[PDB]
Write a protein that binds this ligand. Structure first.
Ligand SMILES: [Ca+2]
Ligand SMILES: [Ca+2]
Ligand SMILES: [Ca+2]
Ligand SMILES: [Ca+2]
Ligand SMILES: [Ca+2]
Ligand SMILES: [Ca+2]
Ligand SMILES: [Ca+2]
Ligand SMILES: [Ca+2]
Ligand SMILES: [Ca+2]
Ligand SMILES: [Ca+2]
Ligand SMILES: [Ca+2]
Ligand SMILES: [Ca+2]
Ligand SMILES: [Ca+2]
Ligand SMILES: [Ca+2]
Ligand SMILES: [Ca+2]
Ligand SMILES: [Ca+2]
Ligand SMILES: [Ca+2]
Ligand SMILES: [Ca+2]
Ligand SMILES: [Ca+2]
Ligand SMILES: [Ca+2]
Ligand SMILES: [Ca+2]
Ligand SMILES: [Ca+2]
Lengths: 429, 429
């Protein structure tokens, strides 16, 4: 028959004697002792430990822990052969075990901007005791700031208490990214046993920030004809997110072929260098946008206008255009003017121009040898001149006039150009 | 002096005559014609196109487009040498160009759950005309559903109109992930010219969904001693997100060494196979959780309890334990019982047990040769027997009793065990 006895009781505690009937202990050997003539049965210097017994290991909750034993009634005035009695001692549980977390530091990663109400599981504490003497409650201990951000809930759904962090306010990683709470587990023994763990919440990053350029808009001056590799400007943007969410790539946004041909933009450095032949005479300003884009899964981006002013070099010689006026008309660079026409009548029209700018296009223009023609301003960097006679002409020694015009810049080095006009005359009586 | 003339006017339009004073056209050659004796000046079969002229290419807004020309006054009763007049014709702009998007399909990616108010840039339309005859307005045309989700704003900040989509309601990719709007660009000419583009918004995924198991909880039966590779159960979770945000990895959540040793869980298939020697006698149930975790940047997850019931095989032979009772006591497997002791006095206590379950542990037990001992039930799968004498004993032909006990299962195949006891007697007068 049965016997209810608390575990871990001190040696020689009476567990009972026979409500039935030499009494000898055949089975139960380390844990029990019997006395003969009485049938009374006590604990020993090996204590019955409800969590220690082999028999009571993987038991489902509510199944008693039963230690089995046999004693043999072996006297009846030395008459009978023995009768044995197969007893059962049901070991009662005392609260001799503390509830424990697997690790004393517990580490939760909660994303930024997680919706209020969101639940996150906390590792279960466990307790080797049974029923009421096992896990009873979880308690969240937090600083004022954190008290308002994190709650604690327990789900009794699994029929085993699963504790959960509730997020209750907005988390922002860029404001604050680590919270220290304590989680305390207590059992339902009297007195209770209790255990604590450090519960860190780390706020995981989300890509909730776009790059921003250091300046809204960028300018730079760049010399025409700069060598390949010449540094033009460096753009830079910043991003307040973490890792790849703040890693940035620079690419041309709106940028026509003409610009892409001349300028190279490094994805990583945002440094713009020369890559082709810059020519103020083809393009005097490079206008384009740069795109700064993060390496988030759904990248965010920003755009910046850049204006590169192209600066003049004196790389163009002046042009001398020699054409007719009124009735006097050139053919294949020669002109028919008849002997005996008024002094300072105009034989040709001379236009002078320079494709460069400022000084580099400021042109002086003048006539070569000893020939009886000069230039008169007719109308800077485009000058129009009458090419007119200095003297009267007779067919004396003439039809041999090659007039040679020379023009020069104010560049450095200065550039020169020359063009000529043949005038054939006609004799008059 | 100047002259204001609209572009693309029909040949022979009068652009004026001399408020000043043979008149001859020296410069301006394809586009203008003059008549002599009058000084009156008209357009030709080559039309002045304000967007076509070389002179008027990369002009900043508000700088007139000036076509330059020269005519020479070359008669004064055939007295003077010629005077030239360097004229300027300022070409007025008409609205002869339509505003255009670079592509007629424009493609915006807006993330799911983007905060209401968020702005997203729409590519600029451009228009080769000038001032009021260029881009005036942008218009967003959308279906009822979309009208409420997307607004349109223009920023006049850059001093060039930058249009922007405003998100005005929640987008959910899992509800709907493609919207067709039309964007219409109109200029400020009378009549206006206008152009449209298809503006697709595609709603980009965010990892806003956690995996869910097909079942909350899983059971399976598994035979003890199953071969390596035997399929146990397959767990499966689903995730309503896109690509990696719904790609799932299965790993043990809470799972003790003992289980991890026996069971293998494929990260990709969620199939659990046998990997070690399952032994109902060591562990009769495998209890563990499985974690399903997505491959999002900040993974979300779900847990499922699994219970594997381990099923018995008859892989254990019965045990025969032979021990003393009362005063009769065994030493080194032999026992001292004296000749002349009552018929059916008990020489030993025989306990029989089988580590298996049900039939596989149901034990029949019996005595071997012709020896004057039998077994009596003393007290299934643990049976206790008195080993008692059948006859009286005299030292006639004795001290030579080797009693052999045999026990068998009800398994398949059945298993057998044997143990023996020597009894030495003592002669009495
Ligand atoms: Ca204990
Ligand atoms: Ca406890
Ligand atoms: Ca206990
Ligand atoms: Ca943030
Ligand atoms: Ca921190
Ligand atoms: Ca970012
Ligand atoms: Ca962030
Ligand atoms: Ca040049
Ligand atoms: Ca020059
Ligand atoms: Ca130059
Ligand atoms: Ca002559
Ligand atoms: Ca036009
Ligand atoms: Ca227009
Ligand atoms: Ca126009
Ligand atoms: Ca969604
Ligand atoms: Ca779609
Ligand atoms: Ca997901
Ligand atoms: Ca989603
Ligand atoms: Ca086994
Ligand atoms: Ca068996
Ligand atoms: Ca078995
Ligand atoms: Ca005898």
């Amino acid at each position: 028959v049965v016997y209810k006895v608390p575990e871990e009781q001190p040696p020689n505690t009476l567990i009972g004697s026979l409500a039935a009937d030499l009494y000898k202990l055949e089975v139960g050997a380390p844990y029990l002792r019997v006395d003969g003539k009485t049938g009374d049965i006590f604990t020993t210097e090996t204590s019955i430990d409800r969590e220690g017994l082999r028999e009571c290991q993987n038991q489902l909750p509510g199944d008693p822990c039963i230690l089995e034993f046999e004693v043999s009634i072996t006297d009846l005035v030395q008459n009978g052969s023995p009768r044995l009695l197969e007893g059962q001692i049901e070991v009662q549980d005392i609260n001799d075990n503390t509830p424990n977390f697997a690790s004393p530091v517990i580490t939760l990663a909660i994303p930024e901007n997680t919706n209020i109400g969101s639940l996150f599981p906390i590792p279960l504490a466990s307790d080797r005791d049974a029923g009421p003497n096992g896990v009873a409650s979880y308690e969240l201990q937090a600083g004022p700031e954190a008290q308002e951000l994190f709650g604690l809930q327990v789900a009794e759904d699994q029929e085993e208490k699963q504790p959960q962090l509730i997020v209750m306010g907005n988390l922002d990683r860029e404001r604050w990214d680590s919270y220290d709470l304590t989680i305390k587990v207590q059992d339902g023994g009297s007195p209770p046993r209790a255990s604590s763990a450090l519960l860190r919440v780390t706020v995981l990053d989300t890509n909730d920030n776009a790059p921003k350029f250091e300046r809204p808009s960028y300018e730079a001056e760049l010399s025409e004809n700069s060598p390949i590799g010449h540094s033009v400007i460096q753009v830079k943007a910043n991003d307040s997110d973490q890792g790849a969410n703040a890693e940035i790539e620079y690419t041309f946004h709106q940028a026509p072929e003409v610009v892409r041909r001349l300028l190279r933009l490094d994805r990583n450095t945002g440094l713009i260098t020369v890559q082709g032949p810059v020519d103020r005479e083809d393009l005097s300003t490079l206008r384009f946008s740069v795109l700064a884009k993060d390496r988030g899964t759904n990248p965010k981006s920003a755009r910046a206008q850049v204006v590169v002013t192209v600066k003049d070099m004196n790389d163009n010689a002046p042009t001398i255009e020699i054409r007719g006026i009124g009735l006097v008309t050139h053919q294949d660079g020669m002109a028919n003017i008849s002997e005996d026409v008024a002094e300072e009548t105009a034989v040709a029209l001379v236009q002078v121009s320079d494709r460069d700018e400022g000084e580099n296009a400021a042109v002086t223009c003048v006539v070569a040898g000893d020939v009886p023609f000069q230039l008169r301003q007719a109308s800077d960097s485009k000058k129009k001149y009458f090419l007119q006679t200095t003297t009267p002409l007779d067919y004396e020694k003439v039809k041999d006039y090659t007039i040679e015009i020379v023009a020069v810049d104010s560049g450095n080095p200065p550039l020169s150009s020359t063009n000529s006009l043949k005038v054939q005359v006609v004799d008059v009586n």
